[PDB]
Amino acid sequence: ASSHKGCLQLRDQSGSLPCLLLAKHSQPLSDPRLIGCLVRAERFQLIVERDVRSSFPSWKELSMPGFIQKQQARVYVQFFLADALILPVPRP
C-alpha cells in the first residue's frame, strides 16, 4: 500500500502493477492485515485502457497512418480473493 497516493499495488524486484482486489461475491476488501503478504493468483484478468487523440477527416482515410497524434495505455489487474492464495512472509 503506497504511502503517497493510497493505491494498492503488487510489487516484486522487477517492478510494480496496480491491482484491484475484491472479497468473495461482491464484497469489498476490508481486512488491513494483508499489507506485506504474498498473493498468488491463478485466475486473474489483465485490463488495458486505450486513449487516442485522433484527427481523422472522414471514413475514407480511416486506414491512413498520419492521423494519430497521442497514444497512451493503462494496465492493471482484477481478481477475486477467494480464488487466490495468501502466504505470510517469514521475516527473520
Binding site: 516484486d12 524486484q13 504474498l38 491463478e42 492464495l85 502466504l87 517469514p90 527473520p92
Partner: protein
C-alpha cells in the same frame, strides 16, 4: 650451499616431530630412508636442474595445510615450467589450471574415519598422520596398500567454497602412491583354491533344498556393480558375478561387511575375481537367495596358476567427460556439451566434492530418455540405483566462484526426489520454476538460503508451498 643442509635438517626435525610413531621407539634410520626415497623419486624422471635434491620443495603437515591454505592448489614433484605448461594445455586453454605448489606430504592410506574408528565406517579413503586425517580419492587401489606409510608425488587440495558448508576439504591423487619403505608383503595362498564357475553357482541356486549352511567359494567375471546404498546404520552394495561372452547368466553377491566396504573402490568391471567363504542369506520379500560375504572372507582375483575347476528407456552404458554445469545442487550436468546427465535419483552426496568440469566418467547401466518435454529438449541420461558411476580422471580447472553465493539449495531437491517421489520431467520443471521464483523474489524480499531452506517441521520452505498447487 648451506641452504640445502639447513633444509635437510628442517626435514629431519619435521620427521622427528610429526612423523615418528608414538607406539615404537623412533628408529633413527627412518630419516635416511625417507631422504633416499625422495632423492630416488626426484632423480627417476631425469629432469633435475643440476641439484640432487629438490630445494624448492618444503615439508608441510596435514594440519598446517588445513590451517594455512585458503585456495585450491595442486602440488607435484619434478614439475618444471615445461611440464606445468603441458599439463595446463592438457587441461584446456579455455579453463584456468589450478596454481602450482612445491610441498611434501607423508601419511597413511587408511579406511578408518577418525578416532571414532567404527562409528563412521562409510568406506571412504582417508589419509591420516599425527596431525590429523584428511580425505583422498584414488582411481584404483590394492588391499595391501592400507595401513602403511606412502609418499605422495602428485596431489591436489580443494578447500570448501561457501562458508555455510561444514566440509573441511578433500584431496585428489593422480599417480600411484610411492611406498616410502619396503612393505612386508605376505605370500599368498600356496595351495590351489578350487572355485565354482557362474554356471555351477546358478545350478546350485536352482537347488533350493541344498543350501542349508554350506560355506563354499564362488568366482566369475564382474558384470554389474550397484550403488553404495546408505541406510541409518547399515551400508550394503551388490556385485554381480557371471561368465561373460555370453554374459547371460550371473550370480548376485551382497557385500555387507563394514571393514570390507572399501571394496567398492577396488572392484572394476570385466575383470574376473575369486571370492572365498561365502554363505547363504535370505532376504525378506524375495523368494531367491543371495550369497552372503562372511567375516573371514578374502577378496581374490582369478589366477589360473592355482584356480582349478508413455514411452520406455533404452538401457546402455556410456563413457564421456563433463564439460558444463547446469544446476550443481540438483545434480544436473552436461556431457560433452551435447547431452544432459541427471544424478538426482542416486545418492551423490559424495560426488559433488570431486566431480566437476574437466572430469571423465565411466557409467554403467544408465537409461536414455528422449522427448521429455516441459521446456527441455536435449536427451538426458539418468542412472538408477541398479548401476554405478565410476570416476576415471580428475579435473584440473579451478572450481567456480559464483556458486559460493547462489548454489546451496540441496536439501529441498533431495527431499523432492526421495520423499514426494517425483518423476524426472516433473523434477526438471520444478528446478526451472524454482530458478524463476528465486530470480523473481530473491534477494531483497528473501535471502537465497531462506527461500530454498529444508522443509523441516515448524518451518516449511516457501518454494515448496508455492509449487504445491501444481505438483499435487
Amino acid at each position: 650451499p648451506s641452504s640445502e643442509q639447513a633444509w635437510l635438517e628442517d626435514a629431519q626435525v619435521f620427521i622427528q616431530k610429526t612423523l615418528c610413531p608414538a607406539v615404537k621407539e623412533p628408529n633413527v634410520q627412518l630419516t635416511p630412508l625417507v631422504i633416499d626415497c625422495v632423492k630416488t623419486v626426484w632423480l627417476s624422471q631425469g629432469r633435475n636442474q643440476g641439484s640432487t635434491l629438490p630445494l624448492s620443495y618444503s615439508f608441510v603437515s596435514v594440519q598446517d595445510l588445513k590451517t594455512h591454505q585458503r585456495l585450491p592448489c595442486c602440488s607435484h614433484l619434478s614439475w618444471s615450467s615445461s611440464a606445468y605448461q603441458a599439463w595446463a594445455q592438457e587441461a584446456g586453454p579455455n579453463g584456468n589450471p589450478l596454481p602450482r605448489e612445491q610441498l611434501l606430504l607423508l601419511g597413511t592410506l587408511t579406511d578408518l574415519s577418525a578416532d571414532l574408528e567404527q562409528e563412521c565406517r562409510n568406506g571412504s579413503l582417508y589419509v591420516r598422520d599425527n596431525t590429523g586425517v584428511l580425505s583422498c580419492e584414488l582411481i584404483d587401489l590394492d588391499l595391501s596398500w592400507l595401513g602403511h606409510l606412502f609418499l605422495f608425488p602428485r596431489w591436489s587440495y580443494l578447500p570448501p567454497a561457501r562458508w555455510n558448508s561444514s566440509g573441511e576439504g578433500h584431496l585428489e591423487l593422480w599417480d600411484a602412491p610411492v611406498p616410502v619403505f619396503p612393505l612386508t608383503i605376505s605370500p599368498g595362498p600356496v595351495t590351489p583354491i578350487p572355485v565354482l564357475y557362474p554356471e555351477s553357482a546358478s545350478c546350485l541356486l536352482r537347488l533350493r533344498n541344498k543350501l542349508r549352511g554350506v560355506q563354499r567359494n564362488l568366482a566369475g567375471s564382474l558384470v554389474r556393480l550397484s550403488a553404495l546404498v546408505k541406510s541409518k546404520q547399515k551400508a550394503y552394495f551388490i556385485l554381480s558375478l557371471g561368465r561373460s561372452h555370453p554374459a547371460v547368466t550371473h550370480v548376485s553377491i551382497i557385500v555387507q561387511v563394514p571393514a570390507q566396504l572399501v571394496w567398492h573402490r577396488a572392484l572394476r568391471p570385466g575383470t574376473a575375481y575369486v571370492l572365498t567363504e561365502l554363505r547363504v542369506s535370505k532376504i525378506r520379500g524375495q523368494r531367491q537367495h543371495v550369497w552372503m560375504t562372511s567375516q573371514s572372507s578374502r577378496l581374490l582375483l582369478l589366477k589360473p596358476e592355482c584356480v582349478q575347476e508413455v514411452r520406455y528407456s533404452r538401457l546402455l552404458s556410456y563413457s564421456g567427460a563433463v564439460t558444463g554445469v547446469l544446476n550443481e545442487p540438483a545434480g544436473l550436468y552436461e556431457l560433452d556439451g551435447q547431452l544432459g546427465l541427471c544424478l538426482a535419483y542416486q545418492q551423490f552426496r559424495g560426488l559433488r566434492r570431486v566431480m566437476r568440469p574437466g572430469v571423465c566418467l565411466q557409467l554403467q547401466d544408465v537409461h536414455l530418455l528422449q522427448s521429455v518435454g516441459g521446456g527441455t529438449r536435449r536427451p538426458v541420461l539418468a542412472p538408477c540405483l541398479r548401476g554405478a558411476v565410476l570416476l576415471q580422471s580428475f579435473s584440473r580447472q579451478k572450481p567456480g566462484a559464483h556458486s559460493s553465493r547462489q548454489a546451496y539449495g540441496a536439501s529441498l531437491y533431495e527431499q523432492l526426489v526421495w520423499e514426494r517421489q517425483l518423476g524426472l520431467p516433473l523434477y526438471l520443471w520444478a528446478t526451472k520454476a524454482l530458478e524463476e521464483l528465486a530470480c523473481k523474489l530473491c534477494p531483497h524480499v528473501l535471502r537465497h538460503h531462506q527461500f530454498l531452506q529444508h522443509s523441516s517441521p515448524g518451518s516449511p520452505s516457501l518454494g515448496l508451498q508455492l509449487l504445491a498447487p501444481t505438483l499435487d
